[PDB]
């Protein structure tokens, strides 16, 4: 029904997505591993959904991520540490929200800083990428 | 001789050897240059009646070697492009350090643990390069 | 084995051997079929490390012959496609009548006076067909 | 990994797919509602997967289809009657097979004639369609 | 006046009003004709600052009417294109039988149960037609 | 400046152009061998310009065409005979007109029937062809 | 409401108002952004039922003025893009200095001697921008 | 017959052509205003043909260019001054050569430095440009 188009403008989602990528996203109920466009502070961001309503989200001392004890499907070539000004973990994911992580985990301004994003702040699932340079 | 020459090719990627830059199922476009390619270009190339993709890591006159800690050296310096893997030789490849011949390109899989690239074949002659991948379309598995 | 497979190719035509259907400088698009081609398709194909274009005049099991008046016969009947030229064998081609082998296509230049087509090479194996020309873009010389 | 390309050459799958459509299919484990290319008698066909190993497949007097009593997700603007030279129904779907139906149900030479197709005869799932005429 | 004119547009379909020919999420290409469109063309058109798609069911001078059994008549005959739905007027549309004006096209949703088409708006002037949908790309929901 | 787009709908210009071809034409002063869109009787046609203001146009008994005695640059695989209800030849081409011929010369409803076309009836030069079937 | 939304448009340029960046007869592609455009983008836009092209010289909140020597100032500084012409106001345009409104873009012809751009119309609301020209194909007149 | 493809890698031909442009060129007899790819010192360059065999090429004190007294068709927003290590002007263009100028005339390493280019060093006429960024 509703489709958006944007140019990715950070490397928060690298290497899955890079600055300058073109994306198409549509407004959806999301699923773990969906990559979504969302808004915080009148600013569009992209991130991947690591957890949904009810899950608990914990860290290991060795930079690892746990959703309900067990670590995630998706792997990234980074260690995941908490943000110091973020909610306490372990962290329970509220109804109507989704816990969102940057694939490039060294950028810690995702749900680890904001908490889970409410639905009304999620603009849609990215269904198509067109990369036209920097292959 | 020639009836027709390529300007572009539109292909689907069959392998994860260029992962994570490229994934199986990705659509790509390449364009064919009549002059030279460049370092870091991802190219489509042919070896053994077999189409392959890889990234140009060195060109004519360059010297390629490895450190004991799985690092790649081009002319004694480490390359621009970084990949989340270590690079080791193919035991049945040519000798290193390896002087890249005139008119050839030394091509590496971004997914370095697959070693069927120039580590096994040596550098590829230009005439076996089909073109440079300039564009990518991914629809699933983002 | 394969890194990548063609879905389309976008090419420029270098020859007038397919004239007047195709002219030098024409841009074309082809698509690659995994199954079989058909009679009257114009295809891009390779023989002797050389890309060529031509039109499929017969397929596996067909019989190709010539009349003394420069006419082509496929299975004893004249073909659908008409060209403003006569068709004669290549003196150094195979024998006719010619039984088209399994898994091959008998390909002819629309500009029949150029005889470096299946009249010289025999029928082409399918694996040497790159794809079917579906689209044409002409900008000059209309 | 392995991709095929073909031109649909019947209207067995109409309106979902029409003769002259171009498709891309890849070799997969299939799911109900997948549309797949398959071979019978050295001939490529396309059809949609209505049932999998273990299911039972039954007809109603009123041209309706039942998979395990309950009728299917996918609806088509045709009634589904059995083929007279086909297996008996109700019909239990063997392991390693998939029961395949034409969307255009008046063409009855699908699994209703052949039975369920074994995997080795399924060439792949159609993932992309390009229709270039007859829109 | 004009800086630029459309030759093609590449669009995504937002509605199921043209279902099953077209579905939400489909990609389409249209081309813009300078002359006339034809019956059965699916076109992109604008009404109320709003882009819409539909299929041309009648043209200038034609007469459109309905039977009591939900059938469409064009010039007293039923149309070529068949859809798996019945066609009824929009209670707030113009009168029928309806004489199609000069320079207009009478456009219908293939999914006839949605009646916001020419049954409500009347026939659309040509200058509000953006072009004809010639190509379709579907990737999900096949 | 002004561009038109049309679908060729005859084979008058075959093989150069075929029914179903897409063309782009722009409004120009034309030159011999230009292929142009023109109007006669509220109907768009296409043809190639064989002669301009001042030229004389004559036929040979052997189906040949003469512009000022000498035959044309462009050759076609047809013989060119006059139309019986057309102007007398030899035929002098008026100022402000262009003598237009069908490449497929067996269709004789070009300038051989109409005479030379005035400029105001020539809609433009075809600069681009896109053939999408029947190659 | 919407049946379909643009992702790309492929257009031909009818004017030399964007010369020498763009020329009459150029083919272009644009893509439609759902978010904001940027300064220096060349965009297709509509004003008075009329498609136009131009280059975004300023955005919301910016201040546009002219020097007596035919120079353009954006926020008191001269802009990045240089054109081989001088810029003067349109005598019947709005007042300058000109505060660019919220949700609008101040658009200028690269060929500045044609003044039917934001110098006459003011800044264009975003909803009247069709998209950004990203690609150019020139075949004649190079 | 023979087509080349290259990426323009200077702004010598700006604004007509810019670094990063893609071009198509074919091997030809050239004409004034043709833009051509040519080689000097095992290096591909592009330039526009200002004069041919027999012409004379002169400069005015006011940065202007004369071909046979009369200045050129093509205008550029630059003044044209000689190169100090180039041939003497006025300069007569030898048979079998073409006098080539950079559109961006402040780059003086064109025929003003090299003299006219022989044919065997001209690789072809640029017939198509594709600009994909920096519009
Ligand atoms: C096949 C080859 C595809 C050719 C497309 C070329 C246009 C690409 C282009 O350069 O646009 C660029 C990508 O933006 C985008 O293209 C944004 C849109 C991306 C959405 C992808 C959706 C694909 C459309 C599918 C419908 C197709 C239906 C066909 C029937 C951006 O250019 P820039 O210079 O401003 O970049 C600045 C930051 N990168
Ligand atoms: C955007 C507009 C798309 C333009 C494509 C135009 C080519 C279409 C064309 O006519 O080919 C036709 C469709 O076959 C096919 O095209 C077969 C291939 C279909 C597979 C679709 C996969 C899309 C490729 C995705 C990769 C893109 C990556 C870009 C970076 C068949 O022509 P005919 O005359 O023989 O027909 C005979 C029966 N219809
Ligand atoms: C590369 C491959 C090109 C893909 C184009 C595919 C669209 C072709 C398509 O089928 O449209 C068909 C041709 O009409 C036409 O396409 C009419 C327009 C032809 C004008 C050609 C001008 C080319 C545009 C150049 C600008 C490019 C700038 C890029 C930056 C007609 O379809 P149908 O089913 O109604 O046919 C009924 C009669 N044949
Ligand atoms: C319509 C939209 C056209 C889509 C084409 C998109 C591909 C463009 C692409 O990015 O390739 C870029 C241009 O090179 C080139 O594209 C080089 C080739 C240019 C020759 C143009 C000839 C056009 C072909 C005509 C035949 C068509 C026939 C159709 C039946 C270079 O990419 P990069 O990142 O390496 O750039 C590094 C320096 N810019």
Numbering used by the authors:
A (entry chain B), D (entry chain B), F (entry chain B), H (entry chain B): 37 to 64, 67 to 173
B (entry chain A), C (entry chain A), E (entry chain A), G (entry chain A): 32 to 173
Manuscript text:
The shaft is assembled by covalent polymerisation of successive BP molecules, while the minor pilin AP1 (Cpa) is the adhesin at the tip of the pilus and the basal pilin AP2 covalently links the pilus to the cell wall peptidoglycan. In FCT types 2, 3 and 4, another gene, sipA, is clustered with the pilin and sortase genes, in a strictly conserved order (cpa, sipA, fctA, srtC, fctB) and its gene product SipA has been shown for several FCT3 strains to be essential for pilus polymerisation. SipA falls into this category of 'inactive' peptidases. We show that it has no peptidase activity, but that it is essential for polymerisation of pilin subunits in FCT2 pili, and that its function is likely to be conserved in all strains of S. pyogenes that carry a SipA homologue.
Here we describe the crystal structure of a SipA molecule that comprises the complete extracellular portion of the protein. SipA comprises two all-β domains that appear to be typical of the S26 signal peptidase family and is highly similar to E. coli SPaseI. In the present structure the 3-stranded sheet comprising strands β1, β2 and β10 is fully formed and presents an outer face populated with exposed hydrophobic residues (Tyr37, Phe39, Val41, Ile43, Leu60, Tyr62 Leu168 and Val170). The present structure shows that although SipA shares the SPase-I fold, the catalytic serine and lysine residues characteristic of active signal peptidases are missing, as was earlier suggested by sequence alignments. Although SipA lacks the catalytic residues of SPase-I, it retains the peptide-binding cleft found in E. coli SPase-I. Examination of the packing reveals that SipA forms an octamer whose basic unit is a dimer formed by molecules A and B, the asymmetric unit of the crystal. Two such dimers then associate through interaction of the N-terminal strand of molecule A with the equivalent strand of a neighbouring dimer related by crystal symmetry. This tetramer forms a horseshoe structure, with two such tetramers associating, again by crystal symmetry, to form the octamer. The electron density is indicative of phospholipids, with a phosphate head-group and two lipid acyl chains, which we have modelled as phosphatidylethanolamine (PE). Four phospholipid molecules, presumed to originate from the E. coli host strain during purification, pack together at the interface between the tetramers. An intriguing feature of the SipA crystal structure is that the peptide-binding cleft of molecule A binds the N-terminal peptide of a symmetry-related molecule within the SipA octamer.
